[PDB]
């Protein structure tokens, strides 16, 4: 063959923290099909928005939104335990079928995206140039989001542990731990990587007993 | 300047599943310093081996081992909660100082690696060619390890939940759940991605009540 039908840009979904996570890489020959198992961001979460993105930027908002749908009826479970399988399937005509399947509930939902959706040739070139020009800014956004995600999981896990310990956790211990959780949650509302990391470290420094107890 | 001192290859550490995780990318100008926070792979783990690797392959064993050390005295906590900060610092002379700091215990350990350690120019070219020739095999190894890691965390989390539920979990429920845990753990000892995923899915299909209970 002299030509191939290939994707001009990355295809994926928005994930926790406002980041684009790629399911089909740029320059993949079609037809193609790729699945990845994802999960809930918080304990007992009953629904996920699957938000389909096209582009090369790390920030979800900087890419081209192709459409979105919900999968609900996710049954109560700890954060990150339900198995939500997301599949991108591009058929021979270039139509994209995105589906999300909750292996724990059985429920499935899909959206169909026309081959003509998304960015046109000029906008595709602009996207590629943009990703090149902002490769550093995007790297910094990416590392801030992973640190903001780590802090949010540490915040939520420690709150659960506190409540589970109840009276077993000495007053002083609880005081130091609570103080630090509030400090972290404030840092998480902000934009500063190092501040989030310092509040995380402040928490590791006073949580010793809580851990111990939680492990008993 | 007409020349720069730059790394010829990736530097990092071995992580859970026998994978190389990069701390300093290939072609970084020295001096340079990079930290990433890592953690324990199992509940109550008291020590981590920091195993310093040089190279471009995903499998740890396929890269060049520069040395290793332990950090112990990690205090009991749930898997993934202790904050273990690993820092690679290459100074102006090309000497690499790797340290690991447990923010929760305060304990620190380091190793110093001479600038002349690791692969020579020929071996560096061979490494680069090898990574090129095996880019697919390495991608498949990488995805198998992430699936094997996900199953191992799901195995370990579900075992904890079972034990915590004790008598609250109906016999039948427990039976189906236990069956599936054994099936997963066997799949994890194997080499087959799809088999691991099917055992995970078998577990999501019978764990509904356990989750519910665990969430109460």
């Amino acid at each position: 063959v002299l030509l191939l039908d290939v994707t001009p840009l990355s295809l994926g979904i928005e994930t926790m923290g406002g980041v684009m996570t790629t399911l089909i890489a740029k320059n993949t020959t079609i037809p193609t099909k790729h699945s990845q198992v994802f999960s809930t961001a918080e304990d007992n979460q009953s629904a996920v928005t699957i938000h389909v993105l096209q582009g090369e930027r790390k920030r979800a908002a900087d890419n081209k939104s192709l459409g979105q749908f919900n999968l609900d009826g996710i049954n109560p479970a700890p954060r990150g335990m339900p198995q939500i399988e997301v599949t991108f399937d591009i058929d021979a005509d270039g139509i994209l079928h995105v589906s999300a399947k909750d292996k724990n509930s059985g429920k499935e939902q899909k959206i169909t995206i026309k081959a003509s959706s998304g960015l046109n040739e000029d906008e595709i070139q602009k996207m590629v140039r943009d990703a090149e020009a902002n490769a550093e800014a995007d790297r910094k956004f990416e590392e801030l989001v992973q640190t903001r995600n780590q802090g949010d999981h540490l915040l939520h896990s420690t709150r659960k542990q506190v409540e589970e310990a109840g009276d077993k956790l000495p007053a002083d211990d609880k005081t130091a731990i609570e103080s630090a959780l509030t400090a972290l949650e404030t840092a998480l509302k902000g934009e500063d990587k190092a501040a989030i990391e310092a509040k995380m470290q402040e928490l590791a420094q006073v949580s010793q007993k809580l851990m111990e107890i939680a492990q008993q | 300047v007409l020349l720069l001192d730059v790394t010829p290859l990736s530097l990092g550490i071995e992580t859970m599943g026998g994978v190389m995780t990069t701390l300093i990318a290939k072609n970084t100008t020295i001096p340079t310093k990079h930290s990433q926070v890592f953690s324990t792979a199992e509940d109550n783990q008291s020590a981590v081996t920091i195993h310093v690797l040089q190279g471009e392959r995903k499998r740890a064993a396929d890269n060049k081992s520069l040395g290793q050390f332990n950090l112990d005295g990690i205090n009991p906590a749930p898997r993934g909660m202790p904050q273990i900060e690993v820092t690679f610092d290459i100074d102006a002379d090309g000497i690499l100082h790797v340290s690991a700091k447990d923010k929760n215990s305060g304990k620190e350990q380091k190793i110093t690696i001479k600038a002349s350690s690791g692969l020579n120019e020929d071996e560096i070219q061979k490494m680069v060619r090898d990574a090129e020739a095996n880019a697919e095999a390495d991608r498949k190894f990488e995805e198998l390890v992430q699936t094997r890691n996900q199953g191992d965390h799901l195995l370990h989390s579900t075992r904890k939940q079972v034990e915590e539920a004790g008598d609250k979990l109906p016999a039948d429920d427990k039976t189906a759940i236990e069956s599936a845990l054994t099936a997963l753990e066997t799949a994890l000892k194997g080499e087959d991605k799809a088999a691991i995923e099917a055992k995970m899915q078998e577990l999501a299909q019978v764990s509904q009540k356990l989750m519910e209970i665990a969430q109460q």
Partner: peptide, 13 residues
């Protein structure tokens, strides 16, 4: 359990 106001797709443990 109280269900959170959260829609984010997260990573599978």
């Amino acid at each position: 359990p109280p269900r959170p106001p959260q829609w984010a797709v997260g990573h599978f443990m």
